Design an enzyme around this catalytic site. Structure first.
Site, PDB file in Angstrom:
ATOM      1  CG  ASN A 140     -23.853  41.533 -35.257  1.00  0.00           C
ATOM      2  OD1 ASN A 140     -24.545  41.800 -36.238  1.00  0.00           O
ATOM      3  ND2 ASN A 140     -24.380  41.245 -34.084  1.00  0.00           N
ATOM      4  NE  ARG A 145     -14.186  42.598 -35.097  1.00  0.00           N
ATOM      5  CZ  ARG A 145     -15.179  43.277 -34.518  1.00  0.00           C
ATOM      6  NH1 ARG A 145     -15.790  44.264 -35.151  1.00  0.00           N
ATOM      7  NH2 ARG A 145     -15.539  42.997 -33.275  1.00  0.00           N
ATOM      8  NE  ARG A 195     -18.835  38.706 -31.833  1.00  0.00           N
ATOM      9  CZ  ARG A 195     -18.813  40.025 -31.892  1.00  0.00           C
ATOM     10  NH1 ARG A 195     -17.961  40.684 -31.133  1.00  0.00           N
ATOM     11  NH2 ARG A 195     -19.595  40.651 -32.754  1.00  0.00           N
ATOM     12  CE  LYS A 240     -24.958  32.105 -40.161  1.00  0.00           C
ATOM     13  NZ  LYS A 240     -24.189  32.279 -38.905  1.00  0.00           N
ATOM     14  CG  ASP A 259     -26.687  34.805 -43.498  1.00  0.00           C
ATOM     15  OD1 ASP A 259     -27.107  34.642 -44.629  1.00  0.00           O
ATOM     16  OD2 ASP A 259     -25.475  34.871 -43.253  1.00  0.00           O
ATOM     17  CG  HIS A 261     -24.565  37.333 -46.466  1.00  0.00           C
ATOM     18  ND1 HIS A 261     -25.019  38.585 -46.086  1.00  0.00           N
ATOM     19  CD2 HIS A 261     -23.240  37.361 -46.264  1.00  0.00           C
ATOM     20  CE1 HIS A 261     -24.005  39.323 -45.650  1.00  0.00           C
ATOM     21  NE2 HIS A 261     -22.913  38.598 -45.747  1.00  0.00           N
ATOM     22  CD  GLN A 278     -50.102  38.299 -43.019  1.00  0.00           C
ATOM     23  OE1 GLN A 278     -49.926  39.156 -42.155  1.00  0.00           O
ATOM     24  NE2 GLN A 278     -51.308  37.999 -43.474  1.00  0.00           N
ATOM     25  CD  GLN A 306     -26.460  27.566 -46.927  1.00  0.00           C
ATOM     26  OE1 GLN A 306     -27.262  26.910 -46.274  1.00  0.00           O
ATOM     27  NE2 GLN A 306     -25.773  28.587 -46.416  1.00  0.00           N
TER      28      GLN A 306
END
Ligand SMILES: COc1ncc(Nc2nc(N)nc3[nH]ncc23)cc1Cl
Ligand code: NI
Length: 316
Positions: A140, A145, A195, A240, A259, A261, A278, A306
């Site tokens: 997050n 940051r 965190r 992740k 994630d 993105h 599903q 990636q």
């Protein structure tokens, strides 16, 4: 006061490694949120700490130039041979990007279009400790940051090395420093929010439950799946972040962090929908499926492939 070097400033104190810009673009690799420790202090001049030493780096179309700052009044010299092997491994220059780009392009026309403007995107080989706690800070957040959080963490818990201009460079802490009683309290005061618990807890866990930072080296040799599983036991470390760490510090090039993105890219750009799942949106299982999708398409450097797209997703 000692000053940040340019290549003009002090060409005596620079050494050089033969490096095509096509195998490595510093400007794509040092900001892009693999590491959060390199800054462009002057134009084309990237300065940050690597293994308790500061560096400034810069390059031409076929050379990578570098200089070192040792700290306590040693006598300024050019990078040694050993110091230059350090920097060679960090960039994993053994790996041919040209070869991989061509392989990826052969199986992926989307990649062909995108990758022309984003050459020289490769993975750093990071120190597992630094990587882990950096990506524990990653939840997050945006890159800016995190950059701040890591710096403040290092200034407050990490050895002082040297000061250049107004910048005081500290090394990354050891686990003991992070696992201390007053740690979370301090970290919270440094803006890390929730965190802070995961940093302290994971530090304390890697010591006691896992038997020190040697455990992370084990994961580097351990096979991908075991390393991932192992990492997910840590506080604040899910699939992740585990895949980030796997790809960026444990030599698992097939690790593909998923994630929202990457969901978005896969759907929009590749027409991917979860099949054997599903529900039509993210889920641990659908994410896992998407990772396998990309591994099956790009092969065993899927993470590196990636990284090229990611680096095109931060440049509009
Ligand atoms: C494919 O290679 C890469 N994978 C992940 C990253 N970095 C991040 N990913 C995400 N989803 N969030 C982040 N927050 N902060 C960094 C960061 C970078 C690369 Cl090159
Ligand atoms: Ni659709």
């Amino acid at each position: 006061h000692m000053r940040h070097r340019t290549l003009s400033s002090s060409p005596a104190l620079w050494a050089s490694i033969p490096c095509p810009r096509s195998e490595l673009r510093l400007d794509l690799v040092l900001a892009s949120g693999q590491s959060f420790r390199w800054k462009e202090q002057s134009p084309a001049h990237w300065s940050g700490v690597l293994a308790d030493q500061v560096w400034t780096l810069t390059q031409t179309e076929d050379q990578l130039y570098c200089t070192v700052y040792r700290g306590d009044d040693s006598q300024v010299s050019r990078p040694t041979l050993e110091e230059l092997e350090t920097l060679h491994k960090y960039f994993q220059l053994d790996v041919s990007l040209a070869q991989l780009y061509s392989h990826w392009a052969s199986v992926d026309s989307h990649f062909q279009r995108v990758a022309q403007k984003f050459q020289g995107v490769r993975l750093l080989r990071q120190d597992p400790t630094e990587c882990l706690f950096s990506f524990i800070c990653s939840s997050n957040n945006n890159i800016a940051r995190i950059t701040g959080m890591v710096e403040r963490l290092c200034q407050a818990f990490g050895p002082r090395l040297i000061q250049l201009d107004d910048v005081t460079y500290h090394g990354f802490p050891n686990l003991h420093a992070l696992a201390g009683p007053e740690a979370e309290t301090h970290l919270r005061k440094l803006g890390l929010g929730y965190r802070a618990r995961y940093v302290r807890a994971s530090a304390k866990a890697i010591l006691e439950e896992q038997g020190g930072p040697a455990w992370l080296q084990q994961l580097r040799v351990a096979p991908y799946e075991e390393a991932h599983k192992a990492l997910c036991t840590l506080p604040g470390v899910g699939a992740k972040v585990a895949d980030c760490i796997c790809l960026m510090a444990l030599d698992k090039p097939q690790a593909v962090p998923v994630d929202v993105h990457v969901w978005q890219i896969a759907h929009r750009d590749y027409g991917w929908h979860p099949k054997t799942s599903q529900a039509k949106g993210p889920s641990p299982l659908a994410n896992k499926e998407l990772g396998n999708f990309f591994r099956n398409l790009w092969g065993p450097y899927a993470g590196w492939a990636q990284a090229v797209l990611f680096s095109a997703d931060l440049r509009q």
